[PDB]
């Protein structure tokens, strides 16, 4: 199931690059 | 702006001898072509089509779905004038060259008569019946009969609106019905994706309309009446039309290459 945790890391990474609300 | 232009031989004043009364041609061309041009002006009054020609508006607004209403008025004005422009005040004797290809392609001039007249009535809807000239790069000139619907144009550059087969009485579950349905989506899908089904030559030289027959109700409903009882009607309108065709001009625009 740990393979699901790294996905949350990769997801939030891109969310930081979308510098717009 | 687009303005109405006079007719060929003062048809607006006198009209045809035994095909249309001067009052009918007035309501058919003057009081209608002017009505279409008034609406056409309002649509192109402040666009790039303001100074373009009718046929130029036809080819330029053929595929764009946001300009289908502009296509109708532009195509209708072009098709309508194309009809009266090929009528003669007096019957004309069919030339020899044209008299040969018609017999070689359709078998006999009388066979072509019933085919066009038969298609006008068999269509049961306002449209135009064309006499197209198809010549592929390798094949010779061949004449066929194409029937367009309300405002469809025969030119290949405007195949997007070559409205030649109704969808309410041609696409069904029957054997022939399914075939038509497949061709329907094959065109819509090919046109949408940009692919071309029938390769054409540059300049749209494949199809060259030569003759036309306007079957709209505003052209015959008044003169030939409704047609109840077999008298007059849309039938007699197509018959009398066949006598006033300008075969001299039809042969000219055909440009049948001499090979005899």
């Amino acid at each position: 199931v740990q393979e699901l945790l790294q996905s949350e890391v990769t997801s939030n990474n891109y969310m930081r690059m979308m510098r717009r609300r | 702006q687009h303005y109405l232009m006079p007719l060929r031989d003062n048809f607006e004043q006198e009209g045809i001898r035994n095909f249309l009364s001067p009052g009918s041609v007035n309501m058919a061309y003057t009081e209608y072509q002017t009505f279409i041009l008034e609406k056409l002006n309002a649509l192109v009054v402040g666009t790039d089509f303001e100074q373009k020609d009718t046929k130029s508006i036809v080819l330029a607004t053929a595929r764009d779905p946001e300009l289908a209403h502009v296509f109708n008025h532009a195509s209708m004005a072009h098709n309508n004038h194309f009809f009266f422009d090929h009528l003669s005040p007096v019957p004309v004797k069919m030339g020899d060259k044209l008299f040969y290809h018609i017999n070689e392609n359709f078998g006999s001039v009388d066979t072509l008569r019933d085919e066009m007249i038969g298609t006008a009535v068999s269509m049961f809807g306002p449209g135009f019946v064309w006499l197209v000239r198809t010549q592929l790069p390798g094949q010779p000139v061949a004449l066929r009969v194409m029937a367009t619907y309300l405002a469809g144009s025969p030119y290949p550059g405007a195949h997007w609106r070559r409205q030649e087969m109704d969808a309410q009485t041609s696409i069904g579950s029957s054997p022939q019905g399914l075939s038509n349905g497949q061709r329907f989506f094959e065109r819509s899908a090919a046109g949408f994706k940009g692919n071309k089904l029938e390769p054409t030559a540059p300049g749209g030289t494949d199809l060259i309309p030569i003759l036309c027959l306007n079957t709209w109700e505003y052209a015959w409903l008044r003169e030939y009446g409704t047609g109840v009882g077999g008298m007059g009607g849309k039938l007699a309108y197509a018959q009398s039309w066949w006598n006033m065709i300008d075969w001299a001009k039809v042969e000219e625009e055909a440009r049948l290459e001499t090979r005899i």
């Binding site: 891109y14 690059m17 | 009054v45 779905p65 046109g191 940009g194």
Partner: protein, 174 residues
């Protein structure tokens, strides 16, 4: 010289400056144009051609008939000219003349939008097919642009995670 005075000069001024300076051109329609286009901001999205053809547009404009004139398109300018005519000839007020010319303008726009939909619907009933529309073309352009951002983000995030982990001086490899 003393330039043309498009507006009355300030009478209360006793020592006026800028006497030899050209003055601003203002018409009664400026107040009306600002009112309309502020109530209809998306009317500015309709492209308008300010390029002149022969300068003879005002020869066929008779605003006593309606909003549809010869040579000019149906735009927010037509409402302002029609409003000004009513507000001067028929003696209507700014608000009354505004509502009248404004309502005539809506009924014409509605027919223009209703004709696009119906014109496309009937064309398909007789074997008429069209190309791609803006809704589809607009989305494809976003796809091609979204990918460029994905590559940038994927290549830009590697910079931070690499520079971040390398921030500590763990190069001893104990």
């Amino acid at each position: 010289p003393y330039p043309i005075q498009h507006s009355p000069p300030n009478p209360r001024a006793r020592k006026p400056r800028n006497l030899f300076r050209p003055t601003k051109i203002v018409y009664p329609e400026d107040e009306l144009r600002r009112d309309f286009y502020r109530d209809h901001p998306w009317e500015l999205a309709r492209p308008r051609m300010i390029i002149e053809l022969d300068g003879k547009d005002a020869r066929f404009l008779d605003w006593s008939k309606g909003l549809r004139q010869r040579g000019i398109p149906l735009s927010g300018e037509s409402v302002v000219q029609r409003q000004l005519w009513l507000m001067e000839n028929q003696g209507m007020t700014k608000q009354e003349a505004y509502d009248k010319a404004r309502h005539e303008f809506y009924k014409l726009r509605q027919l223009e939008q209703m004709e696009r939909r119906i014109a496309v619907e009937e064309a398909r009933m007789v074997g008429g097919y069209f190309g791609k529309d803006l809704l589809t073309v607009g989305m494809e352009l976003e796809n091609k642009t979204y990918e460029s951002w994905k590559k940038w983000a994927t290549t830009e995030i590697a910079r931070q995670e690499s520079a971040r982990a390398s921030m500590y001086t763990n190069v001893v490899d104990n």
